[model samples]
Target: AQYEDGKQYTTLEKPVAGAPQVLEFFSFFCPHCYQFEEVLHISDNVKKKLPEGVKMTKYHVNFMGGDLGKDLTQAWAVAMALGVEDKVTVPLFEGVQKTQTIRSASDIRDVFINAGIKGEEYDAAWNSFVVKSLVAQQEKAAADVQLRGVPAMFVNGKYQLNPQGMDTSNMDVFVQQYADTVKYLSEK
Candidate 1:
C-alpha cells in the first residue's frame, strides 16, 4: 500500500459501493479548490434531490509544498479517523481561504479543536492506524488515478473533469452534469 518513492500518493482506495459514485480530487492550497467549496455545497443540495444509491466522497490532494501539504494531509486523515471529517473540513477550508496566515500543523490542529472535536481525541486520532492507513490509501489512489491537478473528479472511474481541458464557464453545471452521467451509468 506504500509508494515506492516513500512519498505517498494522494488517492482514495475504497471503491464506490453504491450507485453514482462522485469522486472529487482537491488540494488545500489550490485557489480553485477553495472556489469549489461553494460548488460542493450546491452539490450537497443536489445530492439530496437525486434518487437513492447516489454517493459522494472527496479526496484531498497534497499538491502544495512545505508544511501546508503535510499539515493538511495529517489533519484530513485525523478527521477521517475521528469520524468528524465534515466537522473539520469546512472550517479548515475557510481557514485556508479567508486568512493569509501560514498554515502549519499547529494551525490545522487548532482548526480541528475549534470544530468541536476534543483535543485529546484529536491527538489520539492523529496517530491512529486508521489515519495512517487512510493517508497511505490516498497515496495509492493518487498514483492509480494518475491525477495531474486539483479539483478533478471521476465518474464511476470512467469520466474525468480536468479544469485545464474544460472551459471555465459553467463549471458547476458540468459537475452536476457529470454527476447525472454517473447516475445514468450506474443504472446500466
Candidate 2:
C-alpha cells in the first residue's frame, strides 16, 4: 500500500485487453520470496479468492546477488515447461532452504522424477531453447524495473504493489492487499 516510487504505483498509461494479470517478481535466493513460498504452501484458499478474470504470473528476479543466477531461472522455466511450476514451487524452496538438496542441475531432475516426470521428459524440457529464452526475457524485465526489492507485484502490466515498499512485511497483509488490489483493478 506504499511505494518506493513517488506513489504506490505507476499509472497504467495503457491497459491490456482480456483478463488482467498479476505479475509476481521474485527470486529463489530471497528470504521474503521464500516467505511467499511458505504462504503459498500454507493455503491456496486465499489465492483462490482472486476474481475470475485475474491471473497471477510468477517470474524470477535475477537482479539481486546470489540468485544462483541463470541456472535457477532456467529451472523455473523447466517447471513451466513441464506443467509442474505450481507443484514444484514450494518444494524447490524447501529443498534448498530446509535441506540444501537442490542444485541447478541434477537435483532438479530428482524433483521431477519424484513428481513422476520421466527422465526423457525432464531432459527435453530442461534443455530446450525456450527455457533459456524465457529466462532471458525475464532477466531483462527485472533489470528494466530497477525495483529494489523482491516479490514486486504488477497488475495489468503496471507496477501495483511491493510488500517491502509497504509499511509492513506481514504475509497476511500482503495476501489481503494483493486480493484487494486485484479486485479493485479488475472491476474499475
Candidate 3:
C-alpha cells in the first residue's frame, strides 16, 4: 500500500513547496527516531549545498503504547495545520527526548507555551478544524503506509528506509544516501 503523491499524501503545499518530496515518518517515543533526527538536520544543512526544488515533509507517527502518544499526535497535527510546525516541533521533540516528561496533552501544551506561543492560540489551534483533520489524516496515512515501526521514511512514493530496513551500523552512510537519492529523484 504505497502512498501516492497528491492522493494519500501530498507535498507540503506551503510557500516552501517543491518537487522530489521527502517524507520522514517518526514517533516521539522511539529512540531510533531521535537518532535519525540528527541525520535529518544534517540533510537540511546539506540542502543549502544543493540546487533549489528539494522539499522535506516530516510526518510524526502517532502509534505508541500510551496515552501520551495519542496526545502528542493530536498536538502535532494541530500545529501542522496552523502552520506553526516550527514553533512546536523542536520543543515537542525536546520535551520527549530531553525532559523525558511529556506524558499528556497538557505537557505538550505547556511546551508550546514555554516556547512563546500564546496559550489561547495553542488551545484554538488544537481544536481547529484543519488541525483535527490533519491529525486524522496522519493516522490514516500511517495505516496506509503499513508502517512496521517508528522512523520509517518514504521518498518519491517508491523508496523507503528505516532502522530495520537498512543496516543499523551504517546510519551515516544511509543518511547521506537518502540525501543523494532525493537529489536524483527530483531531477528525474
Specify the highest-TM-score model's number: 2
TM-score of 1: 0.75
The sequence of per-residue lDDT tens digits that candidate 2 reaches over residues 53-141 is: 55666787656445354567787888877788877877777776778787667786787788778888878887899887877767765
Q: Which residue pairs show collisions in model 1?
A: 9-139, 11-138, 11-142
Estimate the Cα RMSD of every predicted model relative to the unseen true structure: 8.2, 4.0, 7.1
| Model 2 lDDT, residue 6, Cα | 35
Can you list the residue pairs that collide in candidate 3? none
TM-score, prediction 3: 0.74
Model 1 Cα lDDT, one tens digit per residue, 39-88: 54534644654577667767777767556886687777787677787687
**C-alpha positional error of residue 38 in candidate 3 after TM-score superposition, expressed in Å:** 4.1
lDDT of 1: 0.64
Better of 1 and 2 by TM-score: 2
Residue 33, candidate 1: Cα error in Å is 1.4
Query: Where is the poorest 10-residue window by lDDT in model 1?
Result: 1-10
